Design a protein around this nucleic acid. Structure first.
Ligand SMILES: [Cl-]
Ligand SMILES: [Cl-]
Ligand code: NA
Ligand code: NA
Length: 327
DNA sequence: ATGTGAGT
DNA sequence: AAACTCACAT
């Protein structure tokens, strides 16, 4: 719904101005919740007062709605669209590692373009310099044919270290997408549960090998359970390298792995439906666990899971292939 | 120990 | 959406 898009768009764009330029997080928040409550409203809104009945929509927002409905525009929006102070902050913000905070400082000093940046790397940190360096490759989509190539290399290396490992390339790729933005891997092993020790080596060991075999080129962060970095498909000669690609790797305890794989597969709206449908049956679902709900209305003790199928079974839904998870 | 920042 | 992991400065 699909009938009030003009107002919500206006709202998310006002939300974004507050975060990037005003750095006023409460106004940003109001704008976001006001947008989402309106996007689930059944009727086409014909005035500010009508909208105000919704919880989260108040005086000021109802006033802008009047203006928008009468002019098709909002002066505050048009004003800031012309102002180059914010167009700059928004552009710099497109570099992985640069947010509203770093963005402000740079433009105050006069730094506004990629060319400007490449002359001022001393004002950047590691992560930010890897962002500047590969700003273009990153902004490129990645052809599924390549994904299937990357997938091989990691899973294959993994099995060779310890056959007991389990590794799963998630995201819209798994759903069957024609392409995507980055590569996301979920990893586990039987020695690692939510009740056992704390082996950090399990991740580290698989990260090193990939570096040894020249698959991982750079690092943005690396801890006991999460890795964020850079990989690139290898080239037959020197001639034409592939674009550099982003890749995260995440270690998960065996008892929580498949709730994980479900979550990071989506779709976002699928997760909405499932979490919904898996509520009325009498359960709760998340990144980690599934619990049964109490007669009074409270969850407790995770049920046992050892496959995707197990989750569908509990909520009396039939398993659905990744393909059919867009909606 | 704490706070700010950034990404998923 | 939001809770969680890591980086950097204090
Ligand atoms: Cl708030
Ligand atoms: Cl610095
Ligand atoms: Na960014
Ligand atoms: Na994807």
């Amino acid at each position: 719904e699909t009938l009030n898009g003009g107002i919500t768009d206006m709202l998310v764009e006002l939300a974004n101005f507050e975060k990037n330029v005003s750095q006023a997080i409460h106004k940003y928040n109001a704008y976001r919740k006001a947008a989402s409550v309106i996007a689930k409203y059944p009727h086409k809104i014909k005035s500010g007062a009508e909208a105000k009945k919704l919880p989260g929509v108040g005086t000021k927002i109802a006033e802008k709605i009047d203006e928008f409905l009468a002019t098709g525009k909002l002066r505050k929006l048009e004003k800031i669209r012309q102002d180059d102070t914010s167009s700059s902050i928004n552009f710099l913000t497109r570099v992985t590692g640069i947010g509203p905070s770093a963005a402000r400082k740079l433009v105050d000093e006069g730094i506004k373009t990629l060319e400007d940046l490449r002359k001022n790397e001393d004002k950047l940190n590691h992560h930010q310099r890897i962002g500047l360096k590969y700003f273009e490759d990153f902004e490129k989509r990645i052809p599924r044919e390549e994904m299937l190539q990357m997938q091989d290399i990691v899973l294959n290396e993994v099995k060779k270290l310890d056959p007991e490992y389990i590794a799963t390339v998630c995201g819209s790729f798994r759903r069957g997408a024609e392409s995507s933005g980055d590569m996301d891997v979920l990893l586990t092993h039987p020695n690692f549960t939510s009740e056992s020790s704390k082996q950090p080596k399990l991740l580290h060991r698989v990260v090193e090998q990939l570096q040894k075999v020249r698959f991982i080129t750079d690092t943005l962060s690396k801890g006991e359970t999460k890795f964020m970095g850079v990989c690139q498909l290898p080239s037959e000669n020197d001639e034409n390298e592939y674009p550099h690609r982003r890749i995260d790797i995440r270690l998960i305890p065996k008892d929580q792995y498949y709730c994980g794989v479900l979550y990071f597969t989506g779709s976002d709206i699928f997760n909405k439906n499932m979490r919904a449908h898996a509520l009325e049956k009498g359960f709760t679902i998340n990144k980690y666990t599934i619990r049964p709900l109490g007669v009074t209305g409270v969850a407790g003790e995770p049920l046992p899971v050892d496959s995707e199928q197990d989750i569908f079974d509990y909520i009396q839904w039939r398993y659905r292939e990744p393909k059919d998870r867009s909606e």
